C-alpha cells in the first residue's frame, strides 16, 4: 500500500520537487497510497497525498535536518510503510534519488558542524554497509560516489531525463512566441536572454550579467535578460546597477508558465559554477531555444550532442563567456540551426520517461 516520500522542501518551481512530484504521481497511478514527510509544503496538495510537515526547529539547518530524521523515524516506527524513498541524503532510506552531486567531492575543493553533518548524511546513504538503493540521474557522479565511499556497483541505477510534456514545443509555437514577445514588448530585432531556475548565484547569474554588460554596443542595445527564480533579487540589483543594466534586466519570482519564456526567448544562458544535471538545459532544447552552458553541468553534453548551442570549456574564464555570448548573438544563421537541431533531437531522444523507470525500480 503506502509509500513514504521524503524531501526537505516541497515547492513547485524546483527540479528535485518536480521530479519527486512526477514519481509520486506515477506510483499513485499504480495503486499506492502516498505519504510525504517534509519541512515545508508550498502549493496545492494533490488528491490522496498524506503530507506531514515536521514541527522541528533549530537555528542551524543541519541540526534542523537531524531533528527532522528523528521526528520522521518516530512516526514510521508507529505507522510503518512498505518503502521509503528519499530526495535528500539521510539515514532510513530504502531508495535515494540522487538530485544532488557528491558532497565529499565538492568539500575537497571539516571541523564545521555543517560539513560533518552533510558528509555523515551522505555516508549514511552511500557507505557499503548501507542497503539504500540509488537512482542516479548524472552518470558522471557515480564514480565520484564510488571514489569517496566504495559503494557497490549493483546499488546504482541510472535513469533517463524526466522533462514534462508541456515543455515540448506545441504545434502553435510561433503564436505562443508572438503573444509572449508582445506581452514583454520584444520586437523582431530584440534579443532576449533568459536565466531560469532558483539558485541564481550557483547557476551563475553574476557571470551572465557581466557577459550582457560586456557585449559590443550594437548587440548590447538590442539585448535584455530575464531571470526567473524564487531567490532574493537584492544582491543582483546592486550588480545590475554597477554594470549599468537597470533598463535591460528583470528578475521575476517563480512562475508556472516557463514554456512561454523558452519559446519567446532567443538564448538560454546558464554559466553555472556547478550543477548536478541541469533540467532547464533540456527544457530549452525541446523548445528549440539555443543554449550557452558551462561544461561542468551534467546535462551539458546533450547540448553538444544535439548541436543545440555551445558548451564553454573549463576552466571558467569571464572573457571566454563574454566572447562566446557575442558570437552566438551575432550569428543568426547559427542560432536558427541550433534551434532546428534541438527540436529534431527532442523528437527521437528519450528525455521523458524518468518517472516510469523510477517507479519500476521503486516497486519492481
Ligand atoms: O520559476 C520557475 C523556475 C524554475 N522552474 C522549473 O524548475 C526546474 C528547475 O530545474 P533544476 O532545479 O534541476 O535546476 C525546471 O523544470 C524549471 O522549468 C519553474 O517551473 N518555474
Residue numbers in the entry: 1 to 109, 116 to 370
What text appears in the publication on this structure?
The glycosyltransferase WaaG in Pseudomonas aeruginosa (PaWaaG) is involved in the synthesis of the core region of lipopolysaccharides. The hexosyl sugar residue in each of the bacterial species is transferred by a glycosyltransferase (GT) referred to as WaaG to form an α-(1→3)-linkage. The PaWaaG monomer displays a typical GT-B fold, consisting of two “Rossmann-like” β/α/β domains.
The structure of P. aeruginosa WaaG (PaWaaG) in complex with the product analog UMP was solved in the space group P21 to 2.0 Å resolution. The PaWaaG-UMP structure shows clear density for UMP, which binds in a deep cleft between the N- and C-terminal domains. The UMP nucleotide is positioned by three residues from the N-terminal domain and seven residues from the C-terminal domain. Specifically, the uracil base is supported by hydrogen bonding with Arg173 and the backbone nitrogen of Arg261, in addition to hydrophobic interactions with Phe13, Ile234, and Ile264. The ribose moiety is positioned by hydrogen bonds involving Arg173, Arg18, and Glu289. Superposition of PaWaaG-UMP with EcWaaG-UDP-2F-glucose showed the nucleotide component of the ligands to occupy the same position within the active site. Amino acid residues that support the nucleotide though hydrogen bonding were shown to be entirely conserved, whereas there were some differences in a small hydrophobic area in the binding pocket in close proximity to the uracil base. Specifically, Ile202, Ile234, and Ile264 (PaWaaG numbering) are all valine amino acids in EcWaaG. Comparison of the structures (including PaWaaG-UMP) indicated no significant overall conformational changes, with low RMSD values ranging from 0.252 to 0.552 Å for all structural comparisons.
